[PDB]
Amino acid sequence: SMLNTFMFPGQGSQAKGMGGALFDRFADLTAQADAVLGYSIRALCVDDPRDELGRTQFTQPALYVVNALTYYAKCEDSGETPDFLAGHSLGEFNALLAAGCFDFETGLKLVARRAELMSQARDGAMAAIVNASREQIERTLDEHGLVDTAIANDNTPSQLVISGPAHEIARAEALFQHDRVRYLRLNTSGAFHSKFMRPAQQAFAAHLQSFRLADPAIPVISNVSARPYENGRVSEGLAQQIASPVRWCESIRYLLALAAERGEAIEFTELGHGDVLTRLVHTIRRQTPA
């Protein structure tokens, strides 16, 4: 165990029932979140009456608040403090929160703007590919004229996400179903973490200029660079994140190599609903000869 990394999940990990009793435990944070958002965060999470959890403008605030509350529960009960922080796209906001870069309300405000803009993207899609390398994927996409489709998530060596125009993502299905290679269409109307997000990114960077973001008090591994957020480049890193691939595998691997250089062991604590990142980290570690 030894050095501890707190990690926060993103889109896809949400599920009706998430949060639970944490909402009333943190009754004041919860009321702060309803006032920022203009609806009940607890209702959206526990009950989900309009089946809203899967639409990105709601998914994102849901994740953030659940990740945060789980993080506060963990801090209080366990007593532990992170030596390192990383979050997966949305989850990066909770990493920056735990590094003291903004307060709870301010992150939620950033998230709501992020989530609103990303929701405006029409005509894109994403699909997760299992058991092809990056090189197989990129070649295959080239060979079949999927010109606007690229890697959006590099999650583990055998698990990557693509995004592009909906029809390209649709045509890809046929290209990634064979031998071990598998394909899964995801839920979204946006080609997230690709060039289609550029307008959201710029709109989001502009919104960010209204907020004074502190340098991290605990290292946060940035999705864009797979390296620690620089002092002074927080808003920079945060904004670039949106149109860039999420370099999850490399971020984890950077932590594994850092622990080793320091002769220390390293563990990963997933803070939020589900075990999505827990399973990614096991797979990464199993690969990555040691």
Coordinates of C-alpha atoms in Angstrom, one line a residue, residues 37-230:
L37 CA -27.8 23.5 -10.2
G38 CA -31.5 24.5 -9.8
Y39 CA -32.7 20.9 -9.2
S40 CA -32.4 18.2 -6.6
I41 CA -29.0 16.4 -6.9
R42 CA -30.3 13.7 -4.6
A43 CA -33.4 13.0 -6.6
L44 CA -31.4 12.8 -9.8
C45 CA -28.9 10.4 -8.2
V46 CA -31.0 8.1 -6.0
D47 CA -34.4 8.1 -7.8
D48 CA -33.6 9.3 -11.3
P49 CA -37.3 9.8 -12.3
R50 CA -36.9 11.2 -15.8
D51 CA -34.1 8.8 -16.6
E52 CA -31.6 11.7 -16.9
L53 CA -28.5 10.2 -15.5
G54 CA -27.2 9.1 -18.9
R55 CA -27.5 12.5 -20.6
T56 CA -24.2 14.3 -20.2
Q57 CA -25.6 17.6 -18.8
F58 CA -26.8 15.6 -15.8
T59 CA -24.3 12.7 -15.7
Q60 CA -21.5 15.1 -15.0
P61 CA -22.9 17.0 -12.0
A62 CA -24.1 13.6 -10.7
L63 CA -20.6 12.1 -10.9
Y64 CA -18.9 15.2 -9.4
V65 CA -21.1 15.4 -6.3
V66 CA -21.1 11.7 -5.7
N67 CA -17.4 11.5 -6.2
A68 CA -16.9 14.5 -3.8
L69 CA -19.2 13.2 -1.0
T70 CA -17.6 9.8 -1.2
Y71 CA -14.2 11.6 -0.9
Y72 CA -15.3 13.5 2.2
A73 CA -16.8 10.4 3.7
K74 CA -13.5 8.6 3.1
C75 CA -11.4 11.5 4.6
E76 CA -13.4 11.7 7.8
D77 CA -13.8 8.0 8.5
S78 CA -10.5 6.5 7.4
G79 CA -8.3 9.4 8.2
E80 CA -6.3 9.0 5.1
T81 CA -4.7 11.6 2.9
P82 CA -3.8 11.1 -0.7
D83 CA -0.2 11.4 -1.9
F84 CA -1.4 11.6 -5.5
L85 CA -4.6 12.5 -7.3
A86 CA -6.0 11.5 -10.7
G87 CA -9.5 11.7 -12.3
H88 CA -11.0 10.4 -15.5
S89 CA -12.2 13.3 -17.6
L90 CA -15.0 14.4 -15.3
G91 CA -13.2 12.9 -12.4
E92 CA -10.3 15.3 -12.8
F93 CA -12.5 17.9 -11.3
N94 CA -12.7 15.9 -8.1
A95 CA -8.9 15.5 -8.2
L96 CA -8.5 19.2 -8.5
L97 CA -11.0 19.6 -5.7
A98 CA -9.1 17.3 -3.3
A99 CA -5.9 19.2 -4.2
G100 CA -7.5 22.4 -2.9
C101 CA -7.6 24.1 -6.3
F102 CA -11.2 25.3 -5.8
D103 CA -14.0 24.7 -3.3
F104 CA -16.9 22.4 -3.7
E105 CA -19.3 24.9 -5.2
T106 CA -16.8 26.3 -7.5
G107 CA -16.0 22.9 -9.0
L108 CA -19.7 22.2 -9.4
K109 CA -20.1 25.5 -11.2
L110 CA -17.3 24.6 -13.5
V111 CA -18.8 21.1 -14.1
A112 CA -22.3 22.5 -15.0
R113 CA -20.8 24.7 -17.7
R114 CA -18.6 21.9 -19.0
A115 CA -21.6 19.5 -19.0
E116 CA -23.9 22.0 -20.7
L117 CA -21.5 22.7 -23.5
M118 CA -20.5 19.1 -24.1
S119 CA -24.2 18.3 -24.3
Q120 CA -24.7 20.7 -27.3
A121 CA -22.5 18.6 -29.5
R122 CA -24.6 16.9 -32.0
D123 CA -23.8 14.2 -34.4
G124 CA -20.9 12.5 -32.7
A125 CA -20.4 9.2 -30.9
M126 CA -18.0 7.0 -29.0
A127 CA -17.3 3.2 -28.7
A128 CA -14.9 1.3 -26.5
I129 CA -12.7 -1.2 -28.2
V130 CA -11.3 -4.2 -26.4
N131 CA -8.2 -6.3 -27.5
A132 CA -6.7 -4.1 -30.2
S133 CA -3.6 -2.0 -29.7
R134 CA -3.6 1.6 -30.7
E135 CA -1.8 0.7 -33.8
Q136 CA -4.2 -1.9 -34.9
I137 CA -7.1 0.6 -34.3
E138 CA -5.5 3.6 -36.1
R139 CA -4.6 1.4 -39.1
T140 CA -8.0 -0.1 -39.3
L141 CA -9.6 3.4 -39.1
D142 CA -7.3 4.6 -41.9
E143 CA -7.9 1.6 -44.1
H144 CA -11.6 2.1 -44.1
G145 CA -11.9 5.8 -44.5
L146 CA -12.9 6.7 -41.0
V147 CA -11.0 10.0 -41.3
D148 CA -12.5 12.0 -38.5
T149 CA -12.3 9.2 -35.9
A150 CA -9.5 9.0 -33.4
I151 CA -8.5 7.6 -30.0
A152 CA -10.3 9.5 -27.2
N153 CA -9.4 7.4 -24.1
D154 CA -6.4 5.3 -23.7
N155 CA -7.5 3.3 -20.8
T156 CA -5.4 0.1 -20.7
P157 CA -3.2 -1.4 -23.3
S158 CA -6.2 -3.5 -24.5
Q159 CA -8.9 -0.9 -23.9
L160 CA -9.3 2.3 -25.8
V161 CA -12.2 4.5 -26.8
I162 CA -12.7 6.1 -30.1
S163 CA -14.8 9.0 -31.1
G164 CA -15.9 10.6 -34.2
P165 CA -18.9 11.3 -36.3
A166 CA -21.8 9.0 -35.5
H167 CA -21.9 7.2 -38.9
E168 CA -18.1 6.5 -38.7
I169 CA -18.5 5.2 -35.2
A170 CA -21.4 3.2 -36.6
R171 CA -19.4 1.7 -39.4
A172 CA -16.5 0.8 -37.1
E173 CA -18.7 -1.8 -35.4
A174 CA -18.1 -4.2 -38.2
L175 CA -14.4 -3.6 -38.1
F176 CA -13.8 -4.4 -34.5
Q177 CA -15.7 -7.7 -34.1
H178 CA -13.5 -10.5 -34.8
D179 CA -11.0 -12.8 -33.1
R180 CA -10.6 -11.3 -29.6
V181 CA -11.4 -7.7 -30.5
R182 CA -14.7 -6.5 -29.2
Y183 CA -16.7 -3.3 -29.7
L184 CA -19.1 -1.4 -27.6
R185 CA -21.2 1.7 -28.6
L186 CA -21.4 4.2 -25.8
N187 CA -24.1 6.6 -24.8
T188 CA -23.5 10.1 -26.1
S189 CA -24.4 12.4 -29.0
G190 CA -20.9 13.8 -28.8
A191 CA -17.5 12.7 -30.1
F192 CA -15.9 13.6 -26.7
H193 CA -12.2 14.2 -26.4
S194 CA -11.7 14.8 -30.1
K195 CA -11.5 17.9 -32.4
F196 CA -15.3 18.2 -32.4
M197 CA -15.1 19.5 -28.9
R198 CA -13.1 22.4 -29.8
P199 CA -15.9 24.9 -29.6
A200 CA -17.0 23.6 -26.1
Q201 CA -13.3 23.8 -25.1
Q202 CA -13.0 27.5 -26.1
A203 CA -16.3 28.3 -24.6
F204 CA -15.2 26.5 -21.4
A205 CA -11.8 28.2 -21.3
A206 CA -13.6 31.5 -21.5
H207 CA -15.8 30.6 -18.5
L208 CA -12.7 29.6 -16.6
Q209 CA -11.4 33.1 -16.7
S210 CA -13.9 34.1 -14.1
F211 CA -12.4 31.9 -11.4
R212 CA -9.1 32.1 -9.5
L213 CA -7.8 28.5 -9.4
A214 CA -5.1 27.7 -6.8
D215 CA -2.0 25.6 -7.5
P216 CA -2.5 22.0 -6.3
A217 CA -1.5 21.2 -2.7
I218 CA -1.2 17.4 -3.6
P219 CA 0.1 16.4 -7.2
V220 CA -2.8 15.9 -9.7
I221 CA -1.9 13.9 -12.8
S222 CA -3.4 15.6 -15.7
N223 CA -5.4 13.7 -18.3
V224 CA -3.9 15.8 -21.2
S225 CA -0.2 15.2 -20.3
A226 CA -0.2 12.2 -18.2
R227 CA 2.0 14.3 -15.8
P228 CA 1.5 16.5 -12.8
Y229 CA -0.4 19.8 -13.3
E230 CA 2.1 22.6 -13.5

